[PDB]
Amino acid sequence: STGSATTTPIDSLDDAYITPVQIGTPAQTLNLDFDTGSSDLWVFSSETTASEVDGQTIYTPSKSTTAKLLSGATWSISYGDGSSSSGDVYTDTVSVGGLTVTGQAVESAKKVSSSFTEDSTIDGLLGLAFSTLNTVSPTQQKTFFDNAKASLDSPVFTADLGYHAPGTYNFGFIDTTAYTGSITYTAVSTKQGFWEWTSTGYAVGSGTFKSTSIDGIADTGTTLLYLPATVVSAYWAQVSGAKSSSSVGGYVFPCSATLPSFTFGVGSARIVIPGDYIDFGPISTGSSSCFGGIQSSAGIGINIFGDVALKAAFVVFNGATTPTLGFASK
16 A cells, blocks of 8 residues: 655744545544654644643544544654643544554644644644654554554655645655656664664765764754754854844844755765755844854754754655665755
8 A cells, every 4th residue: 555645834933744534434634743753643622621622623532433443542742842732532533645554653742832732733743753752551552654654555654744735645655757857864872763874974065075974863853953063063163144143042143144054964965955945034023133044053962953864865765674764856
């Protein structure tokens, strides 16, 4: 089998991407944030504290003839940005772009933190990291991809995120028309439960490539590109007036600037992030100070190749017995 679904930016800045997901019988379609940095599929639901719901589409398991309470199971998750959610668990039929998994764990939110409430466009998350990070207790549950794997034509999914435009998540096949040149594959460590890999270095604008190992994760659920302070300082030094602002919480730059590109290495290959991808607009409405899309990972504890990086590439998440990652230009 295969699946193919369009993923759409939630706003003009590409702050996140939503993908329609069919849950239950009859189908209830929710727009989920596909997140290769976590491993829980959770949704706003009929069980979510009413004051914590503001515009989201909810899953109502009592209206699904295929929903079954997973007795005794609970979940609770916290994300790198400080947000969180928790609740109980059903199993139900879940379909993504024509690909169907029966008995998928659908984690029903009873509580969500304010950042989720405040985002009316995201109805939940669909985790695509390794199932070892799944938070369901006392019986850990498998991701959608993990459940689908055996049935897929090939045990892979691909992320093709758009810049200020829709893109595509595919399951079970590589669309050879979706990228240019070749796909370069690179090793993955699953030891932390992430799609963790090592970039071979970077360049700023038209500058020379610096060969240096950068360990990080491919995370579609993180907006920005988080890299070591040395690398990030080298980038923003090429932007007149750019500075790290503690009050804002990262690098800002004059909105009148033309940003340089940023290149990262995948083995001997190179992915170029155009400068415009690194502009996340005024820090506040009407400001002439703009927020940077490349930020320091210092204090996160890990480097994160988030959407800013991934949307410059066609990315293969290869879930073979020994997982790997592939990157192609597009």
